[PDB]
Symmetry: D2
Subunit: 317 residues, 4 copies
C-alpha cells in the first residue's frame, strides 16, 4: 500500500527550516520539524505550509516537540546544536552537541530505528561516529553531510575561475570536515579536461589552484564572518536534501559524505569524508580516488585530526 515518504528534521533552526522548505517545495516527502524550543518549529511549519500551494506541492509539514511524531520516518536529518557560531574551530561545539546527540539517538532508536540518518551537527565526523555508537544503528544507515558542501564550494570556485557551469566541474573534497579537509586537485576535471592541461594551456596557474584549495578549506569563516549571527545554512540544507533524495529515490548517486570507511584509503573502521554510492540501502559502497603521494599524506593528517578530537570526546567531563 502506497505511503507518503517521511523526513524528520531534528532541530528547526536556520538549516532545519530551509530543509523543510526545500523538501516541501520539491514534494520529496512529508516533513516533521522537531525542536525543543517552544513555538519555533510550529511557526516555521505553518509558514512553510502556506507556501505549499504556491509551489504546487501537497507535502505536509508539521512542527513538534514530541519524538513520537517522528515514528515511521524514512529519513532523519539531525541539525540539533547548542547556540552560537564557532569562533575558530567547529570542534568548540564538541561537548555540548555530543550530549544533544545522546538524546536524539534515544528518540530515533525508539521511534524510527530503520531510518536513514544524515547527521549535520558539528563537529560533523566525530558527531556521526558518536551518534552511530550510541544509537546502535547499522553503519550503512548513518552518515554525515559534509563532502557535498565542501565539494560544491570547491567546484564553484573552480567554475568561477574558468567562467563555466559548475555542474560541468568534477571535483571532490575528502577527509574530515575541518581545516584538514582535502580538496583532491589531482582528480579535478572541467568538461573532461584535467587541471594539468589548463596549466600547460596558460588558463590557470598552480598558485591560483592553491588559492582555490585554501578558499575551500576556510570557506565557512568567509560566510560566517559576513552573516555575523551564525554559520552557513542555505547550502548545507540543499546538500542534506540531495543526500535524502539519493536514498528516497534509490539513485545510486555518487555522494561525498562522512561514512564508515574500513577497507579503503588505508583505514580500518573510521567515519570520514569519502565518495560513496547512496541508494535505498543507505551507504552501499565507497569509491577509491586516485590520490597522489602528497594527497595521501594530507589525508593522513586529516585522519589524525579526526582521531584527536574523537579521543578528546572519549575523555569528556
Amino acid at each position: 500500500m502506497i505511503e507518503r515518504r517521511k523526513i524528520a528534521v531534528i532541530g528547526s533552526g536556520q538549516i532545519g527550516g530551509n530543509i523543510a522548505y526545500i523538501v516541501g517545495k520539491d514534494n520529496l516527502a512529508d516533513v516533521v520539524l522537531f525542536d525543543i524550543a517552544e513555538g519555533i518549529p510550529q511557526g516555521k511549519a505553518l509558514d512553510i505550509t502556506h507556501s505549499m500551494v504556491m509551489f504546487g506541492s501537497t507535502s505536509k509539514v508539521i512542527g513538534t516537540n514530541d519524538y513520537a511524531d517522528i515514528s515511521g520516518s524514512d529519513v532523519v536529518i539531525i541539525t540539533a546544536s547548542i547556540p552560537g557560531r564557532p569562533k575558530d574551530d567547529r570542534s568548540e561545539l564538541l561537548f555540548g552537541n555530543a550530549r544533544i546527540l545522546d538524546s536524539v539517538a534515544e528518540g530515533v532508536k525508539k521511534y524510527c530505528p530503520n531510518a536513514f540518518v544524515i547527521c549535520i551537527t558539528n563537529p560533523l565526523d566525530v558527531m556521526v561516529s558518536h551518534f552511530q555508537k550510541v544509537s546502535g544503528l547499522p553503519h550503512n544507515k548513518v552518515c554525515g553531510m559534509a563532502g557535498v558542501l565542501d565539494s560544491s564550494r570547491f567546484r564553484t570556485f573552480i567554475a568561477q575561475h574558468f567562467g563555466v557551469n559548475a555542474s560541468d566541474v568534477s571535483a571532490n573534497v575528502i577527509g574530515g570536515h575541518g581545516d584538514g579537509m582535502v580538496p583532491a586537485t589531482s582528480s579535478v576535471s572541467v568538461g573532461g579536461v584535467p587541471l594539468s592541461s589548463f596549466i600547460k594551456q596558460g588558463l590557470i596557474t598552480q598558485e591560483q589552484i592553491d588559492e582555490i584549495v585554501c578558499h575551500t578549506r576556510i570557506a565557512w569563516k568567509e560566510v560566517a564572518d559576513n552573516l555575523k549571527t551564525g554559520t552557513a545554512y542555505f547550502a548545507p540544507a540543499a546538500a542534506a536534501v540531495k543526500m535524502a533524495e539519493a536514498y528516497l529515490k534509490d539513485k545510486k548517486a555518487v555522494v561525498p559524505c562522512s561514512a564508515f570507511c574500513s577497507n579503503h584509503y588505508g583505514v580500518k573502521g573510521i567515519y570520514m569524508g569519502v565518495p560513496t554510492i547512496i541508494g535505498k540501502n543507505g551507504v552501499e559502497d565507497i569509491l577509491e580516488l586516485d590520490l597522489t603521494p602528497l594527497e595521501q599524506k594530507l589525508l593522513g593528517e586529516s585522519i589524525n585530526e579526526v582521531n584527536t578530537i574523537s579521543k578528546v570526546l572519549d575523555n569528556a567531563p
Copy 2:
C-alpha cells in the same frame, strides 16, 4: 540578443534571502541582494551561491550595498524595512518605512526605471502607493505582494477542511492587506463546486466558513506568535517569486495583488488588493468578481482604511 533575467532584492533580511534562494534554485534569474547592513547580503549571496551547483542552476547571486549594481534589473522586489515585528496591526511602521522607500525609489529611478517593481514592505498598500508617487514609475509597473499570500492561506484552510489538494481550490482575497482584507467566499470553488453547494450537501457549515474567513485574516499572528523573533517569511518570499514569474514568463496569470485600480470596484484611482492579469507589460488587466452586498460593504470599509492611512503620510509634519 539573449541576456540573463535579473531580479534585484532590496532588503536582504528574512524574506529577501529566501527570495534569492528560490529564484536561484529555479534558475529564474540572476539575483542582486541589496542591503545597507554590512556583511548580511554578501554572506547570504555567498552561501546561496554554493547551493546553485547542488540545484543544477547557473543563476549568479551577488550581495551589495551599491544601487549601481541593480542597473538593468528586469524586476525589483522591495523587502527593506525598519526592525521589529508588528504588534496588533501592520500600520505602525508607516513613517520609517516610507523614508526607506524614498531611497529605494531614487535608486530604481536612476539605475532601472523600466523594472517591474513588487513591493512587500509594510504597510503594504500605502507603501506601494508611496513608492509609485516618489519613483514616478508607470502605475502598471508597480504593485504590492499581499493577495497571493492571503489567497494562498485562504485556499489552504478551505483545502484542509475538505481534505483535498489546495491547488484544486480557487479562492481570492481582495482589499487591503490588513484586518480589513476580504476573503471573497462567493468566489470560492473546489474543483468546480461552490461553497453554497457544499452547504446544501452538508459537507460544510456556515460557521465553519466564518472560521476559515477569520483564520485567514489573523493567520499572520499565529505564525508570528510562534516564531517570536519576527513575522512570516517563507510563504511571503514564495508569493513574491510567483509574481516575478508571471512577469518574466509573460504568463497572463491571475494574480491577486495591490494594483492601481482605476475603473473597477467603484474607485477612480487607488492601490488596493484586486485580481490582476500579470504579463510582460506588468499589471495588464483587472478582473471584476461577483461580490455580494456584504462583500461590497467590507471592501468599501477596506478602501477607507487605505485612504485614511495614506492621507496621514501625505501630511508630513
Copy 3:
C-alpha cells in the same frame, strides 16, 4: 524498506511511449513498457533510457512482452488497442478492444492485483467497466483517463478566448468520453469570475461559449484529421501521468475521470466521467457539481449513450 515506484504501461504505441518518456523525465517511477509487437517496446525503452541522463533522472525504463515483468507494479496504465483511428465514433473499436482487455485483465490479476489501474483504451467508459468486471479488481482501484483530457481542452479554449493562463481557468467536462460529453459551462470560472459576469461585461457571448462547448466535444476529430495516421497522443499521455502522480504521491487531487459512481448525479452504479478525489487508496471520493436543469438533461443523454454501447458489448459476437 524503500522500494522504487513502478508503473506498467500496457501498449507501447503512440501514447504508451510518451507516458514512459514523461514518467522517466519526471523521475516519478520506473517504467515497464509492455507490448505484443516484437521489438517496439524494447526499442522505445532503450531510446528513452538514453534520454534519462539528459534529464537527470535515474528512472529505469524497460521494454517487454512478458506479463511477469509487470509484477509488483504500483500503477498499470492500459493503452492497448487494435490498429487504425476511428472514422466517426470511438465505439468502432469496441469489439476488438474488449477482447484485448480480457487478456490484459488476466495479466494484471495474476501479477499485480493490488495495482491502481488507469484505462485509456477507447471506447473509454465502456472499456473501464469491462476491465473491472473481468479483472475483479475493486471499483476504487480501476478508473479511466478521459475527463482530464476533455477538461484540459475545455479550459484551453476558454483560456484562448480571454487571453489568460489556462491554469487560472476552472472548468469541468463530465459524463461519457464521446459526443455526449458534458462541458458544464454553469460552473466555469476565470480567476473566480463566472461566465455570466463576462457576458454582462461584454467580454464573451453565449454563442462564443456554445462554440467552445462544441469545439470541446469534437476536439478529437480536429487533431485526428490533421495527424491522419492516428488520434491524439501527447495530451492523453500527459493526462495519464497526472492521474498516476495523484495516486503515487497521495495528492487528494480533484481529478475528472471515469469512475464507478453509485450515489451521485442520479445514477446507481455506473462508470462515467465525474470529478473525483484521487490518493493512495485510488478513487477516494466523488464530488457533486452544481448542474443546471439543462445540464442534468445533457448528462442524462450521456448516460444513455454509455448504457447503449454497454448493451451492444453485452451482446457481442
Copy 4:
C-alpha cells in the same frame, strides 16, 4: 522589454514533435512547428497545446508551413529530412537533405538571421557545414547535435557497468557523428575516479571498456532494429533541448557538439564533434581534451571522413 523566448522546429516528424512537447512542458519557450507536410505540424501543435495546462505551462505551440512564422526566433532546430531510415551508414541521404537545408537556410536568412541554429538532420557534420555556408550565419551561431546524444549513451553504458547514477559519470564523445565517432576513454571519470584506476582496482577490464566503446558507436542500430519504422527520436529530441537550454539560459555549459573548430585538435577551420562552451553568444569556446596517441589517430581518421563526404557535396554534378 521582456519578450517570450521563441524556438522554431523545422521538420515536425518524430524528433521535431518531441522537441515541441518537452520545450512546452518545461516552459522554456514558445514553439513554432514548421513542416511542408500538410496537417502534421498543426495536429501535433494542437495536441501538445492541450497538454500545456496539464503541465502548468503557458508556452504557446503552433503549427505552420510558412517561414514568415519563424521570424524573431531565438533558436532554430532543424530536423527536416527525406523519409526512410539509414541502412548501414547515416551518409546515404546527402543530396536530398542538402537540398532541403537550402530552403531552410533561405528561410532563416530572411526571417531570423540572428538565431542560434542547431542542426540535427543527417549526415550531421556535413549538413551543419552546408547550412552555415548557404545561410551565411556566423560560425558560432551554427552547430550540430550529435555529441550530447553519443556522450549520453557513453555515460549511460559506463554507469550500467558500475551500477551508479549516469549523471555522476563524466564522459565525452568527439569526432564525426558516424562509425568514426571517438568515445574518449581517457576523459572518463565516475565521481572523480578514472578508468585506469578502476582497471587497477579490478572493477572493470579493458575488454569491457572496448565493448562499451563499441556499444556507443553502434547504439543507433540497436534502437532502429527494434523500432523498425525509423531511427531513435526520444533521446535526440532531449539532446537538442539541452543545447537550446544552454543558449537561452546562458549557462556557459560544456556541450559536445558539431562546431566550427579553427585552432584546436590540429585543424584550421572545420565542423566536427568537440567539447564546446555554449552561452548567450552561441558556441563561445572549445575545450582541448588530453587525447592519447590512439585517440588522436582515430580522430584524424574521423576528420578525413568529414572532408571526404563534404567535397562530394561541393561537386554538385
